[PDB]
mmCIF file of C-alpha atoms and ligand atoms in Angstrom:
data_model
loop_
_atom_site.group_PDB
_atom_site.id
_atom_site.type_symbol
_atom_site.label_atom_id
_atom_site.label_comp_id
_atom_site.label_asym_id
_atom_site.label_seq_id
_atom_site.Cartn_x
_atom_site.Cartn_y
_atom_site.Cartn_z
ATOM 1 C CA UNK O 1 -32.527 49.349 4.637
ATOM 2 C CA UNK O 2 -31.887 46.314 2.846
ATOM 3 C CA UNK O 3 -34.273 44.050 1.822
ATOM 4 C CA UNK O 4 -34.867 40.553 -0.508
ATOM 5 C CA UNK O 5 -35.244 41.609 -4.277
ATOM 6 C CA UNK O 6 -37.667 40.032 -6.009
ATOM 7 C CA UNK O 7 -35.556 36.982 -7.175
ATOM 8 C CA UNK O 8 -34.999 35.581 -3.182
ATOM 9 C CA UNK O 9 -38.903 36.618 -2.825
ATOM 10 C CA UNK O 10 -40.137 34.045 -5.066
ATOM 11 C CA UNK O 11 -37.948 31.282 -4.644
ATOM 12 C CA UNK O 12 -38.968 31.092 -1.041
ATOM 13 C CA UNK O 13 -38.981 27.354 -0.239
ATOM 14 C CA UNK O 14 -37.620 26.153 -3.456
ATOM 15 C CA UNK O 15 -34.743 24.552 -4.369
ATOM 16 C CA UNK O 16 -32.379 24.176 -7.246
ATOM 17 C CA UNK O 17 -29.250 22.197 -8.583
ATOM 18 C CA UNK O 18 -25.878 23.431 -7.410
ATOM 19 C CA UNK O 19 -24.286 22.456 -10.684
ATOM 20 C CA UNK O 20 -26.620 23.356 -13.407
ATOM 21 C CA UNK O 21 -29.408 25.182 -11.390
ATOM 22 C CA UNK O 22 -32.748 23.868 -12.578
ATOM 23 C CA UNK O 23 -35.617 23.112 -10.838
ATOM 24 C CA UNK O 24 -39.420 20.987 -11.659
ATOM 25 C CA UNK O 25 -41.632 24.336 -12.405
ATOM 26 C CA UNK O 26 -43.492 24.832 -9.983
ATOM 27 C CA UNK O 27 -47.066 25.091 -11.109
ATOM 28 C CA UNK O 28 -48.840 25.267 -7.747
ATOM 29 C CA UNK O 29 -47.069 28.861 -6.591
ATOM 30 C CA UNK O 30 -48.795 30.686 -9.814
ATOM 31 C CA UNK O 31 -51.699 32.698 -8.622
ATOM 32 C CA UNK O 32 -54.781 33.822 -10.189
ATOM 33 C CA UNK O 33 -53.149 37.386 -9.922
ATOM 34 C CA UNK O 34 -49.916 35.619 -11.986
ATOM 35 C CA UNK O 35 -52.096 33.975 -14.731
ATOM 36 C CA UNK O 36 -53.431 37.395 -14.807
ATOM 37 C CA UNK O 37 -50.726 39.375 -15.541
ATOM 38 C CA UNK O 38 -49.558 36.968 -17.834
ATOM 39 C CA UNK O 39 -52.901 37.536 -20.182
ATOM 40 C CA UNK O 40 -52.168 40.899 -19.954
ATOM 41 C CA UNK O 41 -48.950 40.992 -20.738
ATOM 42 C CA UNK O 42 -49.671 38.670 -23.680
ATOM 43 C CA UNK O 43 -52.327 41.050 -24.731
ATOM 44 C CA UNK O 44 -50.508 43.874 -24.488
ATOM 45 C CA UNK O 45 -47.456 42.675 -26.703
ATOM 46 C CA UNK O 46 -50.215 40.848 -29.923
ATOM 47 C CA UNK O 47 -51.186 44.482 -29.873
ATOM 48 C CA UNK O 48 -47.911 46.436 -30.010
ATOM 49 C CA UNK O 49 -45.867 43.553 -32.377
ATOM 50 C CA UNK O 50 -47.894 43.230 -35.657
ATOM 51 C CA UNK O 51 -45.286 45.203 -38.566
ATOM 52 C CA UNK O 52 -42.894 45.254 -35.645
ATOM 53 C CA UNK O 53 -41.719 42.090 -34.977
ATOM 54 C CA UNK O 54 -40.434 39.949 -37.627
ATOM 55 C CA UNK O 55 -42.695 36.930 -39.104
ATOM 56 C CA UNK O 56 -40.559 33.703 -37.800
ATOM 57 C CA UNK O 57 -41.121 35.126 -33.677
ATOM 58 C CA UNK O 58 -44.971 35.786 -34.710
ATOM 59 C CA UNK O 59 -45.156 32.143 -36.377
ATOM 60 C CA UNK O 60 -43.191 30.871 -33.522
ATOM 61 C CA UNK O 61 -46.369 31.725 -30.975
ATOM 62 C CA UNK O 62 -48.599 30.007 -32.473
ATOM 63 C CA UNK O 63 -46.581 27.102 -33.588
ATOM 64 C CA UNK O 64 -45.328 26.115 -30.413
ATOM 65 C CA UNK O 65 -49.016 27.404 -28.879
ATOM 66 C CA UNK O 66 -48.233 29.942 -26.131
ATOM 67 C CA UNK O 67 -50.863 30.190 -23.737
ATOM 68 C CA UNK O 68 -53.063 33.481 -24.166
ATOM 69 C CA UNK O 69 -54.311 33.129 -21.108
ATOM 70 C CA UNK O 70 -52.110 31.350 -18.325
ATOM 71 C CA UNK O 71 -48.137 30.906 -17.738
ATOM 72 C CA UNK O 72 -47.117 27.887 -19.767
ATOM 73 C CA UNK O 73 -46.766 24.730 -18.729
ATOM 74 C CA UNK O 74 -43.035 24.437 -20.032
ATOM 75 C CA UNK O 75 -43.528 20.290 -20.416
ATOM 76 C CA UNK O 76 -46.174 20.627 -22.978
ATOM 77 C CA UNK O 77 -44.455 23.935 -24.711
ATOM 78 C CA UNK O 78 -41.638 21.208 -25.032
ATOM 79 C CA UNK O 79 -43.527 18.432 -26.546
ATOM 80 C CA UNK O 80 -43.478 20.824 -29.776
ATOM 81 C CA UNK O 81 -40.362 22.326 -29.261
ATOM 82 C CA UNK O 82 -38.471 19.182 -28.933
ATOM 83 C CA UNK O 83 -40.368 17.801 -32.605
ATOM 84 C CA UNK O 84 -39.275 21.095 -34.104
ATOM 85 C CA UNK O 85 -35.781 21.955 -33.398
ATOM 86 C CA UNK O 86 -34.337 19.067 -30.331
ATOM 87 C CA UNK O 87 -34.455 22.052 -27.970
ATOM 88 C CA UNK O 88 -36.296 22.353 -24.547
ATOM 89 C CA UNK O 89 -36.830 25.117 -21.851
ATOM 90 C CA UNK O 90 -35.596 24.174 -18.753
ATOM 91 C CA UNK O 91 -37.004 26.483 -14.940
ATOM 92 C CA UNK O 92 -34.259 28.053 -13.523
ATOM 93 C CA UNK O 93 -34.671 30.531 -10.381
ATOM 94 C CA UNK O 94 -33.498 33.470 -12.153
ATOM 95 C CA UNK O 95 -30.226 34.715 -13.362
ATOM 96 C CA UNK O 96 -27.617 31.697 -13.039
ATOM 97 C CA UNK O 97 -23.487 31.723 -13.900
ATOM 98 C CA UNK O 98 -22.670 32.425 -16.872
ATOM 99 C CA UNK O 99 -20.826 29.016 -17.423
ATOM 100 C CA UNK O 100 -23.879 27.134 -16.241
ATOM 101 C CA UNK O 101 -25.906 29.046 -18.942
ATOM 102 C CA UNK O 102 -23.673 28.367 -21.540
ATOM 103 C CA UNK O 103 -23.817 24.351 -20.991
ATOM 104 C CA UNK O 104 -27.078 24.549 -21.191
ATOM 105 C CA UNK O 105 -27.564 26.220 -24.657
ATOM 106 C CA UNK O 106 -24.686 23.970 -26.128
ATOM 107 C CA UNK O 107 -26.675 21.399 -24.669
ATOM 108 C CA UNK O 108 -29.393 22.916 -26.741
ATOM 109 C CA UNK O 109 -31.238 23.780 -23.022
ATOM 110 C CA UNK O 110 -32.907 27.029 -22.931
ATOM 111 C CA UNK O 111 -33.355 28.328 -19.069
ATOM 112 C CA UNK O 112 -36.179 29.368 -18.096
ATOM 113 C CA UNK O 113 -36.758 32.439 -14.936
ATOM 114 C CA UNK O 114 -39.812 30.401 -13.284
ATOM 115 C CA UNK O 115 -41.691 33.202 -11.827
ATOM 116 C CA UNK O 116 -43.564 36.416 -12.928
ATOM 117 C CA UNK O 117 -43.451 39.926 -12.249
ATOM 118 C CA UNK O 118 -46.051 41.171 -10.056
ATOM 119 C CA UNK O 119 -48.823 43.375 -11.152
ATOM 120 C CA UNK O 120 -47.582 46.241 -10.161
ATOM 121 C CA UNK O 121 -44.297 45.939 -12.097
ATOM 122 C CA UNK O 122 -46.595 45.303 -15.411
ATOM 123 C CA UNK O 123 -44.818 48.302 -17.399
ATOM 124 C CA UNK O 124 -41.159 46.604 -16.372
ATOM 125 C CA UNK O 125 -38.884 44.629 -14.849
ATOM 126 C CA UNK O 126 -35.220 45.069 -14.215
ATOM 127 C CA UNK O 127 -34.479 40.900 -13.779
ATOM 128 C CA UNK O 128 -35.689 38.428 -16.670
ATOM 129 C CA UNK O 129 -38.915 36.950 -16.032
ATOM 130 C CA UNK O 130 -40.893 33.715 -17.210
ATOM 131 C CA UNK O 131 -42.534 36.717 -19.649
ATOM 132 C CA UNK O 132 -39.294 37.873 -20.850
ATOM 133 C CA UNK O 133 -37.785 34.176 -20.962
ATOM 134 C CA UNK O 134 -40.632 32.486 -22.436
ATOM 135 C CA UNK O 135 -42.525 34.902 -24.832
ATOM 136 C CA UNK O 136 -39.411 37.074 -25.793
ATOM 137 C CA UNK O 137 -36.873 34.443 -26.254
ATOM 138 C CA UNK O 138 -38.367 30.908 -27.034
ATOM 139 C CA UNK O 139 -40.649 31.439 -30.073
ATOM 140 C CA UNK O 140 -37.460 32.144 -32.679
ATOM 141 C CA UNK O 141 -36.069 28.388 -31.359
ATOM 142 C CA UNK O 142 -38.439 27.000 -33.701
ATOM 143 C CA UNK O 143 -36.133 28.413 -36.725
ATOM 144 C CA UNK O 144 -33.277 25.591 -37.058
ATOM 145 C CA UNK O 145 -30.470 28.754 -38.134
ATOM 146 C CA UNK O 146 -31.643 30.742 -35.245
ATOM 147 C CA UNK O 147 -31.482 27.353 -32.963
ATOM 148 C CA UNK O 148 -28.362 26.652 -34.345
ATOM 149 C CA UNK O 149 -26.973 29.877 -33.940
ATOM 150 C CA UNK O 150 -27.578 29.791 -29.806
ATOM 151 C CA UNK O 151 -25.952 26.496 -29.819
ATOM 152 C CA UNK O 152 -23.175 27.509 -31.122
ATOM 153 C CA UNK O 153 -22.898 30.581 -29.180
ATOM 154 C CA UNK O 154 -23.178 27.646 -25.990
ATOM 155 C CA UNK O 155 -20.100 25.671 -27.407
ATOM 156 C CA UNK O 156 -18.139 28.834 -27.129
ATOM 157 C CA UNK O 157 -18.506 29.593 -23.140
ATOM 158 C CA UNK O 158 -15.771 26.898 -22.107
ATOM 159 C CA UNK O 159 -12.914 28.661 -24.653
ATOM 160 C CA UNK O 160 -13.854 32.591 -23.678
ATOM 161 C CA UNK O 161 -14.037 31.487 -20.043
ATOM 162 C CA UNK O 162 -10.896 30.012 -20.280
ATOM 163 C CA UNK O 163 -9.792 33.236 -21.756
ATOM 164 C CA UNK O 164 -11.392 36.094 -19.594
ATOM 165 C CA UNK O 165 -13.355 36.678 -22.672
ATOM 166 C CA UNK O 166 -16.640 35.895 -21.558
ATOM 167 C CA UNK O 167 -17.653 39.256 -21.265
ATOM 168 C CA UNK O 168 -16.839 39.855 -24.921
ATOM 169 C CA UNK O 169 -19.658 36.764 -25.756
ATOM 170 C CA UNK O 170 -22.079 38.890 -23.717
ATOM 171 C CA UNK O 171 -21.524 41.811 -25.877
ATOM 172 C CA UNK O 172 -22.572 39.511 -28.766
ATOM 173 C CA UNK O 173 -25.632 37.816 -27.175
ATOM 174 C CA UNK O 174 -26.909 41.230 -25.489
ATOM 175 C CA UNK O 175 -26.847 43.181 -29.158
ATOM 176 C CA UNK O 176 -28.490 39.776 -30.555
ATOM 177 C CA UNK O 177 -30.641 37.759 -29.189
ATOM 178 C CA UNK O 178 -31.685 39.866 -26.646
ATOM 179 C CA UNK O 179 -31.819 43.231 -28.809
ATOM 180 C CA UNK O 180 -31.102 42.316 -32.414
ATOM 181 C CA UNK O 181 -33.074 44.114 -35.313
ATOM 182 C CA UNK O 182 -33.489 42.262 -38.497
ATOM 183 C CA UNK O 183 -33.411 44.406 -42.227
ATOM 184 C CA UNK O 184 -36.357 42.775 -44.606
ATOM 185 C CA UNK O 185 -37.811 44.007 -47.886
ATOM 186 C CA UNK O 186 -40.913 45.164 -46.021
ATOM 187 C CA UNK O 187 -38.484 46.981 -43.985
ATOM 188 C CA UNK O 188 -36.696 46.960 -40.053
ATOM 189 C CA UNK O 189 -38.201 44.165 -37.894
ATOM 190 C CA UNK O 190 -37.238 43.128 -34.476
ATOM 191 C CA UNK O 191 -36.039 39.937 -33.370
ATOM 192 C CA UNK O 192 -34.239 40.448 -30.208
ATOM 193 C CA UNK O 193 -35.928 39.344 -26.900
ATOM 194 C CA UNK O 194 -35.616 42.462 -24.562
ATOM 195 C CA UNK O 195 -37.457 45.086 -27.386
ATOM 196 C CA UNK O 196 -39.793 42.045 -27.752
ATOM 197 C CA UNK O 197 -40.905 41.627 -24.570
ATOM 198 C CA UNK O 198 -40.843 45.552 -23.824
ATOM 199 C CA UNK O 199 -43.938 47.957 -22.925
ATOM 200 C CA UNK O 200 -42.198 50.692 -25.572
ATOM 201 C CA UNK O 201 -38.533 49.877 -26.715
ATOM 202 C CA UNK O 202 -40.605 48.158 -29.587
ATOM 203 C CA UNK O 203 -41.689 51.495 -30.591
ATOM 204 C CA UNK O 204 -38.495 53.554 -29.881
ATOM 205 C CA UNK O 205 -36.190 50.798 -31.879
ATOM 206 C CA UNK O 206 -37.983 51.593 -34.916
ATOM 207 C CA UNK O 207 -39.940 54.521 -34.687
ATOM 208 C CA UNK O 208 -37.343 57.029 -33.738
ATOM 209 C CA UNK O 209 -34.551 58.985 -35.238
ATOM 210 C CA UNK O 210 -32.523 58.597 -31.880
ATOM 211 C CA UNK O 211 -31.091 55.543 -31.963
ATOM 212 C CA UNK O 212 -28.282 54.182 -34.302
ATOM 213 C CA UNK O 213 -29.077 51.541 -36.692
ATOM 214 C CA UNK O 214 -25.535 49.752 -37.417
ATOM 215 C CA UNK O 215 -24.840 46.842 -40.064
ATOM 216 C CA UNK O 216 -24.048 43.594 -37.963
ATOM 217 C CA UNK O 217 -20.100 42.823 -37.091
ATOM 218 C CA UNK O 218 -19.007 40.932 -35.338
ATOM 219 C CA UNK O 219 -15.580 42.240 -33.718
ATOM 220 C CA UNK O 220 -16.989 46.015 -33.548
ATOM 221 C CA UNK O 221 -20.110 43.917 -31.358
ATOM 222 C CA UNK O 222 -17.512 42.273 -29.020
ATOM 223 C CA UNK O 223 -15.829 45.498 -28.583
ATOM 224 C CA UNK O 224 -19.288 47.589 -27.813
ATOM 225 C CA UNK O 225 -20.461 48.380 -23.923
ATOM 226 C CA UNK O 226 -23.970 48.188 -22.907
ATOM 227 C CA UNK O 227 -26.136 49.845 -20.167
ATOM 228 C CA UNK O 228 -28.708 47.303 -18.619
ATOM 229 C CA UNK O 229 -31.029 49.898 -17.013
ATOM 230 C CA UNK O 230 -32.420 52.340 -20.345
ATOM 231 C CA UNK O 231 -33.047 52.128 -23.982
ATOM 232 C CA UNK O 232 -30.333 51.166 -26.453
ATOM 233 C CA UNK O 233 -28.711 53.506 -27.741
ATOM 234 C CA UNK O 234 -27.385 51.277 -30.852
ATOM 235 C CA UNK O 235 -28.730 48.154 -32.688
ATOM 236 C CA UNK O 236 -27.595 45.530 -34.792
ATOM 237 C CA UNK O 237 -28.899 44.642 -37.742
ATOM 238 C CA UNK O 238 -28.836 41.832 -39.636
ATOM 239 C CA UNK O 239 -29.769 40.929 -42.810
ATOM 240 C CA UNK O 240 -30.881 37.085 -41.922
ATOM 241 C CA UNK O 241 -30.019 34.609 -39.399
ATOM 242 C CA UNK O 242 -27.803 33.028 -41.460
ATOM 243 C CA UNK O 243 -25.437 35.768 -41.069
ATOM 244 C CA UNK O 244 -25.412 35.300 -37.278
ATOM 245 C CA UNK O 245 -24.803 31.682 -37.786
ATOM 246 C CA UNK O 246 -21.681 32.238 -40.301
ATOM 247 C CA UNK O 247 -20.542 34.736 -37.502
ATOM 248 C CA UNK O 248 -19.633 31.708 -35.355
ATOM 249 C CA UNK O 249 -17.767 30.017 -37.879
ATOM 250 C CA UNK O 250 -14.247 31.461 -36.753
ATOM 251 C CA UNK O 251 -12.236 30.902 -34.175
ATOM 252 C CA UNK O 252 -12.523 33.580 -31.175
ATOM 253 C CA UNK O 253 -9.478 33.574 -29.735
ATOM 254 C CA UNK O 254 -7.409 35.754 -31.450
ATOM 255 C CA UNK O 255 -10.246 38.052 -31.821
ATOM 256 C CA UNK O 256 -10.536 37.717 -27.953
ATOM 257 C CA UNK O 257 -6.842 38.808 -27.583
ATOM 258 C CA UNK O 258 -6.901 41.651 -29.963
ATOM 259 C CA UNK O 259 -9.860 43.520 -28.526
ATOM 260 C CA UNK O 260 -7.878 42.160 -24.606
ATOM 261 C CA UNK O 261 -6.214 45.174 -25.143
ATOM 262 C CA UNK O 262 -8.319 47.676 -27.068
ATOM 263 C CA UNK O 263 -10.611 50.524 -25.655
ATOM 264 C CA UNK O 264 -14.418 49.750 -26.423
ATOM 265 C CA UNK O 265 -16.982 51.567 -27.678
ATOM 266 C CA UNK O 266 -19.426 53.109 -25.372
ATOM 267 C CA UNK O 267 -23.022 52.233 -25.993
ATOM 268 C CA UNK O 268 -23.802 55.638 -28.110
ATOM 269 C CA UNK O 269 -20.881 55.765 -30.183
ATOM 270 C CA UNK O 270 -20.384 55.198 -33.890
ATOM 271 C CA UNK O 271 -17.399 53.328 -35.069
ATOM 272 C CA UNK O 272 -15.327 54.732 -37.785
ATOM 273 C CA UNK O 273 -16.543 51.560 -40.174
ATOM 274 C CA UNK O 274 -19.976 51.100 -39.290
ATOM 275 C CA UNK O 275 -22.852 50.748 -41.663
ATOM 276 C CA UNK O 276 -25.212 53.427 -40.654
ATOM 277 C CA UNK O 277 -28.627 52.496 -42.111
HETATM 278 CO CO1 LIG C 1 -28.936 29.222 -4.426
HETATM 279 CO CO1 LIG C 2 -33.233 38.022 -22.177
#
């Protein structure tokens, strides 16, 4: 039997652009039960992140005021974010095309998944939710490098799509912004969305002797496969958002041709060159 996943569940009676995909959120379709498990999950995560996450996503919560105990209104999260960086949040319905998604962040638009996971799926979700979107990936826009960094990473879509590359960009925005790890003084933070919005990949990503820890670069990134459905295997690390920044700075196409033809790396292996920290 097949039946609608989660994503067609929600959007039941809703509507959305056929060119860039956003919608007004809709404020009247979250429950008690969503508001809920939002306060939960909010809970849940202040407990886990202290000494885990870095200091700019912490600061970013309470700068840009993150309901504790509701889903967000994303007009007044805006109001701030807007004064701090030019960006906004934009509701989407869930996962959009890729092309869409990247004229949106060079657009300095960050979508949005609307809805929440129900309560039963508390532990995880396999799709992004407005948990995942909003409290893993939104705080760190407040940081102009970090800001400027996703914009960037927008401008590129039109030249890797005209290239086939685009996959190649998602190997760089998977092992960054959504699970990057960032090297301080006081030691390995996280700053990538997907460990921050986790139950537990906050605690393996540190924690454990089982994953790799590699030095950020950028064509051994592009050339590294991920698995969507289990723990990383490797991270990234930087040493400061300026790095990922700088890491824009040349052009991608003849980087896009040269790995065209190369084998990549498998999620678990170690490159002959890496930085193993
Ligand atoms: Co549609
Ligand atoms: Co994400």
């Amino acid at each position: 039997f097949v039946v609608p996943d989660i994503t067609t569940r929600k959007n039941v009676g809703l509507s959305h652009d056929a060119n860039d995909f956003t919608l007004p959120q809709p404020l009247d379709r979250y429950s008690a039960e969503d508001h809920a498990t939002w306060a939960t999950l909010y809970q849940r995560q202040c407990k886990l992140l202290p000494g885990r996450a870095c200091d700019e996503f912490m600061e970013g919560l309470e700068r840009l005021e993150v309901d504790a105990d509701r889903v967000p209104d994303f007009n007044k999260l805006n109001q701030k974010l807007m004064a701090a960086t030019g960006w906004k949040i934009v509701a989407v319905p869930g996962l959009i095309p890729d092309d869409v998604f990247f004229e949106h962040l060079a657009n300095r638009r960050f979508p949005v998944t609307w809805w929440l996971r129900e309560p039963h799926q508390l532990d995880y979700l396999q799709e992004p939710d407005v948990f995942h979107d909003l409290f893993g990936h939104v705080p760190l826009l407040i940081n102009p490098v970090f800001a400027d960094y996703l914009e960037a990473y927008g401008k590129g879509g039109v030249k890797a799509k005209a290239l086939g590359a685009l996959p190649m960009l998602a190997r760089l925005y998977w092992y960054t912004v959504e699970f990057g790890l960032i090297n301080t003084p006081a030691g390995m933070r996280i700053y990538g969305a997907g460990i921050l919005s986790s139950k537990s990949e906050s605690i393996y990503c540190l924690d454990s002797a089982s994953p790799n820890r590699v030095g950020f670069d950028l064509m051994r990134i592009m050339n590294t496969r991920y698995r969507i459905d289990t723990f990383q295997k490797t991270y990234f690390v930087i040493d400061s958002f300026k790095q990922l920044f700088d890491a824009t700075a040349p052009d991608f196409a003849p980087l896009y041709l040269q790995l065209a033809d190369a084998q990549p790396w498998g999620a678990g292996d170690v490159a002959p060159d890496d930085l193993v920290l």
